[PDB]
């Protein structure tokens, strides 16, 4: 349970769990019963039962052109690794300021504190999506 | 001398069970080994008190303790027997002969 390092928190927990699966896989492929029927007591004995708090912790919730600023953060979106679908704010931020540096210097501020915005966008949807494929994952 | 060959049976798997401990040691015992005496564990939880209760009995009646017309069908009986018994000798042999 990291609450400022939520994203790796779960990542972990997760690959953790893959390990623990494949074992769990060998294990009953040949044989053993204590270390299975310990995890189970302290899984089930009776205070919430252990998976079921597990379960409850991850968390099910979550100057421009508006239309053309949607499209162009939709062609900074990419898959990360977990198939959490974020939009890449430096990618974003980079093609705005090139947008911007491309009547058109006294609205030089106004069109890159827009940019900023676009990318501050991005940069929420991007963790948004990570936050996804990590509940995901879980 | 059958007394002796029970007691001293119990003398050999001792020192049979002695030697399968001494050596054998040593975090080794395992998948199929451990297997069998999980099995065997198994199989000494699958009585004794029936068996007390018949002991009993047996005590009880020892305690307790401290017809011409049918002799005719008993020799019917067993001279249908001494009958079958050629013909089974018989079929024995035929089969040998098969072989």
Redesign the interface.
């Given at each position: 349970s990291v609450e400022e390092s939520e994203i790796s928190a779960m990542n972990q927990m997760s690959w953790l769990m893959k390990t623990a699966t494949i074992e769990l896989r060998i294990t009953s492929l040949?044989?053993q019963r204590s270390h299975t029927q310990r995890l189970l007591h302290l899984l089930l004995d009776d205070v919430r039962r252990k998976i079921l708090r597990i379960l409850d912790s991850i968390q099910f919730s979550n100057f421009f052109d508006r239309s053309q600023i949607e499209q162009v953060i939709a062609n900074c979106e990419h898959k990360n690794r977990r198939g959490q679908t974020v939009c890449n704010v430096k990618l974003l931020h980079r093609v705005l300021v090139a947008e911007v540096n491309a009547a058109a210097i006294g609205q030089r501020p106004l069109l890159m504190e827009e940019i900023n915005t676009i990318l501050q966008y991005v940069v929420e949807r991007n963790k948004l999506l990570q936050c996804l494929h990590a509940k995901r994952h879980a | 001398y059958k007394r002796k060959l029970m007691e001293l049976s119990h003398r050999v798997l001792q020192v049979l069970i002695k030697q399968e401990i001494q050596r054998k040691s040593g975090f080794a015992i395992q998948?199929e080994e451990?297997?069998l005496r999980v099995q065997l564990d198994t199989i000494q939880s699958e009585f004794k008190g029936r068996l007390n209760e018949l002991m009993s009995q047996i005590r009880m009646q020892n305690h307790f303790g401290a017809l011409r017309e049918i002799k005719q069908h008993l020799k019917q009986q067993q001279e249908g027997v001494s009958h079958l018994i050629s013909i089974i000798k018989d079929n024995h042999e035929d089969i040998k002969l098969i072989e």
């Open positions: 040949n044989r | 998948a451990e297997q």
